[PDB]
Amino acid sequence: GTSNRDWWPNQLDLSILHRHSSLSDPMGKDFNYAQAFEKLDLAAVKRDLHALMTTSQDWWPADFGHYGGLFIRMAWHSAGTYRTADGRGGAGEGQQRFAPLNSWPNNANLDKARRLLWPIKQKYGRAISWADLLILTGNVALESMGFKTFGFAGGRADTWEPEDVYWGSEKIWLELSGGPNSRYSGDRQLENPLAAVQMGLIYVNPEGPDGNPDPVAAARDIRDTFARMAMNDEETVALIAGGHTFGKTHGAGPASNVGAEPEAAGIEAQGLGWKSAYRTGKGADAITSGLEVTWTTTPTQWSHNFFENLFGYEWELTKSPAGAHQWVAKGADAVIPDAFDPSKKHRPTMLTTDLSLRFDPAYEKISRRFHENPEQFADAFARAWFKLTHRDMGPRARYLGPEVPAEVLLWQDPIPAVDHPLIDAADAAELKAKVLASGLTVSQLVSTAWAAASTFRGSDKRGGANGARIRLAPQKDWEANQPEQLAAVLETLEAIRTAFNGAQRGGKQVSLADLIVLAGCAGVEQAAKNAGHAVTVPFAPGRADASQEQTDVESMAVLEPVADGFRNYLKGKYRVPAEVLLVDKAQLLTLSAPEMTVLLGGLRVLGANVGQSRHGVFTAREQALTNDFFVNLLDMGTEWKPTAADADVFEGRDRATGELKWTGTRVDLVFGSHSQLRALAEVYGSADAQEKFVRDFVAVWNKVMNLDRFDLA
Amino acid sequence: GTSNRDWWPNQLDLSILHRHSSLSDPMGKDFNYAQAFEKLDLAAVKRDLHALMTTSQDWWPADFGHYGGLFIRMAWHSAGTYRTADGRGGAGEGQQRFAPLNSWPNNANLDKARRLLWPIKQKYGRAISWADLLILTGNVALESMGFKTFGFAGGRADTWEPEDVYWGSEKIWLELSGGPNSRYSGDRQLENPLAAVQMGLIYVNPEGPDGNPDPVAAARDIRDTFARMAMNDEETVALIAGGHTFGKTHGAGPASNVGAEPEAAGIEAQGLGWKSAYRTGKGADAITSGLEVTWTTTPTQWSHNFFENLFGYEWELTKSPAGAHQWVAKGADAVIPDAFDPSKKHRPTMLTTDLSLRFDPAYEKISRRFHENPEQFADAFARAWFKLTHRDMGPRARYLGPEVPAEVLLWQDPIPAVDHPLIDAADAAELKAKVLASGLTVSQLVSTAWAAASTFRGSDKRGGANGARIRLAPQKDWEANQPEQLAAVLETLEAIRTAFNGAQRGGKQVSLADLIVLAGCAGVEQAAKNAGHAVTVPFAPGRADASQEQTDVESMAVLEPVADGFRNYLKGKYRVPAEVLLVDKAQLLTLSAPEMTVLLGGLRVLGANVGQSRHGVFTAREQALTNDFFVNLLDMGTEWKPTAADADVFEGRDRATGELKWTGTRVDLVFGSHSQLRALAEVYGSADAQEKFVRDFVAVWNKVMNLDRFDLA
């Protein structure tokens, strides 16, 4: 059946905004996963998982009699899709069980690992999500094999459909770079927001870059991709050597024996894939990656034998039984046990990417320190494994259960505890009146609160107004945030704050984070009053102020808005059209298409544009909250044409006289072009819509202000 | 950006079940369009529409100074997409304003027509939907030009995203037959469910079949496509000759002058398309179809001149200025006015498909009767226009406003009014006990109620249990309904009814329609008791019994379920896989994926399969309401393989012994294969889910029982 996507393959796709409706969710509207999890007997779950580790099933026999390595790989892959550029991927939604990730080639035979967990999932039901269970299972694997983990938090609610994520433009699985849809350009520059080297890989190619078995060059890909997953050199070496302390790879015969991935398999395979024609198709005969490497002399026990081997031998290039490049220890004895035959032993082997840890000079120094000091290795690996598996969980307030680590980590963008009474409704009214009396304008107040709150992204639940990090480096100097204007607003608000807090007794105080949001609320109320309408904008106090020392400036860089259609802002010229970047931002903000539309039309008339640009300011009463954006956009009395100077800016002229009325960008005019967005604009641009527009705007404004408020959940 | 659809283009699409969520709808979840419409000043809207008819806009000047013809075509096209096979298409959701229909070649320049209506839409806002407005505008065009319509009903709620409809598999607009994706096979057999001859046409090609200008062969396409839109010969002749009493076609220059359709046009086009480079691109120079035909001497006034011309001249094949085949009257004077230049007149002209009305022998007889008896033509056209524009609105209970025709029409599948007290809760308890005492089984009761209620489709709101049409021809004879078993259940229910009704005082009586549904509820209650659960199933009385004479047997044929996965039924072997047909049925039933899943799993264990087939009956306690289907489907102890005899039947064997445990179809096993379906199955097959399963099943069962109950809206 030919679809709209077939006919108009470049039109904008709004369905990414309308995933995760209550229609597709089997749980009731009132289901609360946190409440279910908090009553889970987590210790009982862990005992069952511990038993599972050595209870082999004949349809996928356990290597060495222990599933621990398989499950560590499973949990690593669950977390390993994460990209810092947009926060998408990661373990936090349990997306490994859906397309496409369930069928990525790098996830081969993890379908078996997930199937092994069904009995436990079935026993505990809604009290433990798949998302939490995948990570917990990796922790229990580690613990069962003698490794002390740093901790665990539950709270990853399950999702019920695939996320819409850009994973690359290639049309062939694992396509080597330089094809018509190459994700590389220039001197091996990987396109943002991607964090893997080939379509269907987690980070890098275990043979080397595009299959070339050079550990030094592989190291460059490792470093780049791991940085794009928020890991530095120390963390990267800890993770790779830690993981590859356990288990083995699978490449017992040629890869042509392996059939369809799960999404392509027959209905009779019942959700499994990669069925192999090679001998028994499993166990001793398994083929997963096509490599055949077992790293340590005790693959089911924590050790420091990975580094002992890495440094204690020299390495020779060889081929697996599937023909993949890998390495074997020169002159070594057969000291590595076989996974099924207790009469057989093997020489030590390594991947190209394992040898990167010795032959890249910066890695080598870390690896040597870990080799000489395995206690340092263990601690770094535990910390990095926690970070890996929790990176997308959001604020520590979301962390559930009895194993949450008490240590507060810089990468968590921590928010201090509140230790004092909060302002009440009367205090909030007093503060709003003081803000408005200071002379701060509607545009200032709205723009500042928008800047503070709209860094949130639901993909990894980073950002938002909590913390008042807009006053700190680097947010205070982001171009989109208008640094000089921002500085002036913050100085005025801080003076109001100081005066209010100095007059209190009893320890009541207001944070700057709360006052920035409250001041924005005052701006929206005043805009409504300018339009002839009395409204109260909801406000919830309880945000706290983070310090500079509690803020990782490098990690905060990825939250810079380089495109923010809600402020008609584009930092430079991109290949992706601006309207597509608007929809991407709306998806990060968790907005529906109606929410996006209302919010944008209101912001335009409130003065939220960066640089006080007139683009899209389709009103003669700026700083009044009206539906003028929609009424004027949809007026057929105005004709629109791209300018000569800039094809992405349009002039709106009176159709009869030629008089110039307005200018607008693609982000403005898409609302009058796209047939679904125009239908939404029409509702808000109708003669009966003033009250609806104001109410819906206040609601979406309050939603955005509260995106990071997991303390109120 | 490569998507799951790209990688696995044949996997099932569940997003069709989760369209139209509260996320994409700008209106609040309590918005009730009927209540808004009932307060509309319809008379005021009609005055504005009358004014609009002759208020020409320079960007699309009105032919003859009157937009009536353009608007009649607009309304006809809104309605004209309807297919009786599935009830999809039609005017009832206002889908002409979305992709793909906004951009079908046959809808060229209807974008202008809709844009002319924006000021009225804006003025009245939510109180008149686009869907209602497009039809009302057609009516007012007719009335303005002297034709008295049969009536009008409001109540078509707007929709907010494109419907997922199979419109064909061709990848080229307007592709002629016999291509790689031909919609024709054999002796010009059009594939079900399609009702147009080429992709992007409403019914037929105005030049003739595949462009061949043979009026006799064109007639055959007209007859077939119109029958597939619920119209017979008399209705067809009336509609075509009635329509083409008005207005003109547009083909002033070559089609190559016409640019991108709306969904392909630039953002500056602001939702319009088909911009033409030919002369002024509009008005006298307009190009729409490429034909240049004006049918009558008074194109802006109702006349009897269509049939005067058709019969009063002989016709000669000629070409328009765009090169399209059309016909001109031999020897005629220039009697037809020009649309813009009062100094120009034209000879009479006709389309190939207009000539069909004279040269097809069956149409000729009707045409001649209408020519000789113009009052019969007027009445038939009025009735056919009403039917055309209301065919998909459902029961008369949905019809709103002061212009609804009193006359009840056979095509409305009318239900008699209820004129007596209804049964109360005490009576329902008594009837359910009598039903269960009669010896009717859970399987019989559930199967019968399912058969009765599940004929509903939300696409045109036909079918459902109201009317008790399951007892009439042709429903009583449908194979899926198990005619012999059905007859025995109905006989027993009618005897219960007769005895109950005979004992009543006052006018109280129960309809068979109600008793069928109530008896099914008793079956479900009994099944729940069989499983140790105390469950009350909701029941709403007030259905009435329709007569045979109120039940058009030929129109009912399209409701026959030839595939019903909920009863594991397939009447024959089809090209579309059975699980795709299941999702299609769920969509017509208005079910989400969780609802479909719960419903199907319950029906399997209640004995609802046609012929008491064991396929998918994954329980050892049939006729008990349990979640056994899910728990057994998901048991990895069982391995599945297609049978030798039949690749669409699967055998489930114990993995360890090889012993046969179950058999199932594609419809059964898809719930264990599709990664989103299996996630839903997992919820219901978990150890904590028995009560959830029962309560969700009762809810969806009741939903299906009430689907046609617009008397309770």
Ligand code: HEM
């Ligand atoms: C440069 C990064 C990495 C590369 C190229 C890589 C590559 C691979 C490959 C090719 C396999 C074999 C798959 C199969 O044939 O079964 C594998 C297995 C494994 N990887 Fe890694 N890996 C990397 C990082 C990691 C990390 C960060 C961890 C966890 C902290 C991890 C833990 C494991 C474990 C436990 C296995 C063994 C699976 C088993 O016993 O079934 N890997 N890796």
Ligand code: HEM
């Ligand atoms: C066999 C079925 C039909 C065919 C092939 C057909 C074909 C066409 C074509 C080619 C045009 C010219 C479009 C353009 O160039 O502007 C047209 C115009 C029109 N059709 Fe039909 N038509 C059919 C049935 C109907 C019906 C059922 C109605 C309404 C009851 C109708 C009402 C009109 C009107 C009013 C116009 C004039 C539009 C104008 O004045 O702008 N047609 N038709």
Ligand SMILES: NNC(=O)c1ccncc1
């Ligand atoms: N394509 N549209 C339908 O199938 C439909 C629409 C509304 N309710 C049920 C089904």
Ligand SMILES: [Cl-]
């Ligand atoms: Cl994601």
Ligand SMILES: [Cl-]
């Ligand atoms: Cl439809």
Ligand code: NA
């Ligand atoms: Na994420």
Ligand code: NA
């Ligand atoms: Na329909």
